[PDB]
Amino acid sequence: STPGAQQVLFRTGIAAVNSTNHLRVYFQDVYGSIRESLYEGSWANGTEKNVIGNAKLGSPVAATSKELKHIRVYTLTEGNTLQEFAYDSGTGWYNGGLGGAKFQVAPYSXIAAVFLAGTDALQLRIYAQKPDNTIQEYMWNGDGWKEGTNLGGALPGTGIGATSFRYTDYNGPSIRIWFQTDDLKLVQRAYDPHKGWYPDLVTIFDRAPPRTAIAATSFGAGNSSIYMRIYFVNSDNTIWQVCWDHGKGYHDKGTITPVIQGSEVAIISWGSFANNGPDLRLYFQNGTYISAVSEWVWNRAHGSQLGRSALPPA
Amino acid sequence: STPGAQQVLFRTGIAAVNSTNHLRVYFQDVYGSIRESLYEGSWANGTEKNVIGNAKLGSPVAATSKELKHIRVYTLTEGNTLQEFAYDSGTGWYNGGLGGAKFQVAPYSXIAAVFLAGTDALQLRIYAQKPDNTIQEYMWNGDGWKEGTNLGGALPGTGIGATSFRYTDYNGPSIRIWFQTDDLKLVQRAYDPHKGWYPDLVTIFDRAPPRTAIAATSFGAGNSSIYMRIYFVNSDNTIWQVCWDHGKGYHDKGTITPVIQGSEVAIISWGSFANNGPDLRLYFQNGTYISAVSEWVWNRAHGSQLGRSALPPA
Ligand SMILES: C[Se][C@@H]1O[C@@H](C)[C@@H](O)[C@@H](O)[C@@H]1O
Ligand SMILES: C[Se][C@@H]1O[C@@H](C)[C@@H](O)[C@@H](O)[C@@H]1O
Ligand SMILES: C[Se][C@@H]1O[C@@H](C)[C@@H](O)[C@@H](O)[C@@H]1O
Ligand SMILES: C[Se][C@@H]1O[C@@H](C)[C@@H](O)[C@@H](O)[C@@H]1O
Ligand SMILES: C[Se][C@@H]1O[C@@H](C)[C@@H](O)[C@@H](O)[C@@H]1O
Ligand SMILES: C[Se][C@@H]1O[C@@H](C)[C@@H](O)[C@@H](O)[C@@H]1O
Ligand SMILES: C[Se][C@@H]1O[C@@H](C)[C@@H](O)[C@@H](O)[C@@H]1O
Ligand SMILES: C[Se][C@@H]1O[C@@H](C)[C@@H](O)[C@@H](O)[C@@H]1O
Ligand SMILES: C[Se][C@@H]1O[C@@H](C)[C@@H](O)[C@@H](O)[C@@H]1O
Ligand SMILES: C[Se][C@@H]1O[C@@H](C)[C@@H](O)[C@@H](O)[C@@H]1O
Ligand SMILES: C[Se][C@@H]1O[C@@H](C)[C@@H](O)[C@@H](O)[C@@H]1O
Ligand SMILES: C[Se][C@@H]1O[C@@H](C)[C@@H](O)[C@@H](O)[C@@H]1O
Ligand SMILES: C[Se][C@@H]1O[C@@H](C)[C@@H](O)[C@@H](O)[C@@H]1O
């Protein structure tokens, strides 16, 4: 191992944000602090001087951004309430408003977060699991936090993946979320502005490990067209990918890379097939230096490759 | 799931003690409390009424006993010091002396504990991992806690299994400990009263998952003879067993039962092959009610069988 790597919690929550190839990765240290590693042409930070706040040990870690102008990082307090660390350009980091709402969730809740796509306005949708095991949406539309739509029952401790995109022919945002049901299937719920939350539940995987990690991205929005990728940890102790491609729908799935038992997973993307992309980066633990966070890369130049072996502070 | 099963921490530390078929099982709830479930002709307890103390979330949990007259349960404080919850018949539960010594260990340390075999005196040996990744023994011999032997380097966050037995031709106790080295092998170290700690590490398994759980038991001590069993979680997401049997040594190993990715494991035993035994009981998580603790049984009557499907409070 390395002393650095030993600072990273084993099975830490992991989240990532980006503006194209300018990246940030969030994780929890063994003391419960949430730290930020950074990529601006090289890997940096992730040290005890790069702490953005504290959360209960073992907390979920979620993040979403508008480029690197606005970053929001979501975790659980010791009281199992949702909280938010906020970065705005020209201010820096501060404690966001979410914590003050004291939204209480199940102690084993995961979190997913999106800024709504295709507007300049800062609108947020956060997803977590209430004590009754339902998935609840929480909303910020610029005038205070309030509950949004309740999306129904899920497996207690389900992972939650989320993405927002805006079709170029629509005048409002779309949302897709994924989670696991009691029967262990992985499913999608979907929001479009005309149909609202669709009264359906699309199965994307028939049977996954209980409380498997779930992470999702989308790219290449067009006229009534989108590309999506959902990742989870399968029973083979590897991350699997599920693909949605416009014109084919949910048409393929398969193994991507090995991970430790119970690894968490984060995904970021940029670009699209139409612009010499997309680019994908996954973050996870695969046993490098025992507890370091590792990266997997997809790009048009070289396809599927392992990226940075061990993120800072390793 | 069930409301009770939802209180059990997913990947909780697990420990167990017994006097023959009178059983106690310790685990951590989602709030960090350490709870006791019991078997006295039937299963009970494990509720908010059966809390014995508090420990850092995700703490190791180890326990040892002299029958059910003296029980000691070891975990980490938020400060990463060793602490002890103690039960003595008549006294009940109390905060043991160990905490006062403020022994600082790695935040990712595991714990093993034994009462030394073959004496009525209360003599304890506790094993944990220091920040320099060495395995340290801590001793109680009736006059305060002291550091004992340091057993050298180990993989950071290694599991630690321990047992003590007394050969019927010896005049003092033996100790065996197992842990994982940086190369990912699982090794034994051994103490006997004529040799002290043997200089050599003995490999019991060539390659195991990093930071796999390790738990051990022994039974059937005779003249220069013993039987031992060591359990760990393999890369196939099952508990494997490693067998020492007198006259054959370390001669077999294999899978026992499936578990959740990253399950912890506890083992208790009683009786012997000579006297229509032994009895073995393993405790682990295998996904029953998502987060319940389950039991596996070995006995002469029926051999290998699943036992209680979901321990109390499930
Ligand atoms: C073309 Se270098 C490649 O992409 C960068 C944006 C980073 O993800 C880096 O770790 C990786 O090796
Ligand atoms: C321009 Se300051 C730099 O980039 C911001 C987007 C944040 O990630 C901050 O923590 C970092 O130090
Ligand atoms: C100056 Se409001 C700030 O930004 C919004 C987009 C929300 O994240 C809110 O909780 C936060 O405090
Ligand atoms: C407008 Se949200 C309000 O102001 C922000 C700047 C933060 O202090 C946040 O915690 C608070 O709830
Ligand atoms: C305009 Se309805 C409002 O915003 C949508 C984008 C969804 O988050 C929905 O659940 C919410 O009630
Ligand atoms: C009108 Se297809 C709609 O949007 C796609 C992008 C998918 O999420 C599909 O499951 C959904 O029903
Ligand atoms: C046309 Se390759 C397809 O799309 C890429 C964006 C990656 O998700 C890759 O894993 C997949 O097989
Ligand atoms: C002969 Se019942 C058998 O043994 C008891 C001692 C308990 O382990 C119980 O759960 C098991 O089914
Ligand atoms: C006779 Se009290 C009963 O048995 C003791 C040995 C302990 O396990 C205690 O917690 C339990 O309530
Ligand atoms: C009446 Se001392 C009591 O029992 C000893 C055996 C030790 O476990 C010690 O730490 C504890 O406080
Ligand atoms: C009699 Se030496 C004393 O007790 C032995 C049983 C071992 O625990 C050893 O490490 C310790 O120094
Ligand atoms: C004099 Se064999 C001695 O004791 C056995 C019980 C085993 O632990 C073995 O590895 C060790 O060398
Ligand atoms: C004589 Se069967 C042998 O010993 C029992 C005590 C159990 O450990 C069993 O799994 C093993 O195969």
Author numbering:
A (entry chain D), B (entry chain C): 2 to 315
Task: Pull verbatim passages from the article behind this deposition.
Aspergillus fumigatus lectin (AFL) was identified in the genome of the A. fumigatus strain Af293 by a homology search using the Aleuria aurantia lectin (AAL) from the “orange-peel” mushroom Aleuria aurantia. In conclusion, our study describes a novel fucose-specific lectin, AFL from A. fumigatus, which prefers the LeY epitope, with the ability to recognize core α1-6 Fuc. The variable composition of its binding sites enables it to bind to various fucosylated saccharides, including those expressed on human epithelia. The probable presence of AFL on the conidia and its pro-inflammatory effect makes it likely to play a role in the A. fumigatus colonization of human bodies and development of the infection.
The structure of AFL co-crystallized with methyl-α,l-selenofucoside (MeSeFuc) was determined using single-wavelength anomalous dispersion (SAD) at ESRF, Grenoble, France. The methyl-selenium used for phasing was observed on the bound fucose, as expected, but also in one residue of S-methylselenyl-l-cysteine per monomer, indicating that Cys111 received a seleniomethyl group either from SeMeFuc during soaking, or directly from the solution. The complex crystallized in the P1 spacegroup with 4 monomers per unit cell associated in 2 functional units (dimers) and the structure was refined to a resolution of 1.60 Å. The AFL monomer is composed of 6 blades, each formed of 4 antiparallel β-sheets. AFL crystallizes as a dimer that is formed by two monomers in pseudo 2-fold axial symmetry. Electron density corresponding to MeSeFuc revealed six binding sites per monomer. They are located on the opposite side of the molecule to the N- and C- termini, each of them between two adjacent blades. Binding sites are pocket-shaped, composed of different sets of amino acids, although some of them are conserved or semi-conserved. Conserved Arg and Glu/Gln residues form one side of each binding site, establishing polar contacts with the O-3, O-4 and O-5 of bound Fuc. The opposing part of each site is formed by a Trp/Tyr residue that enables hydrophobic interaction with the apolar surface of Fuc (C-3, C-4 and C-5).
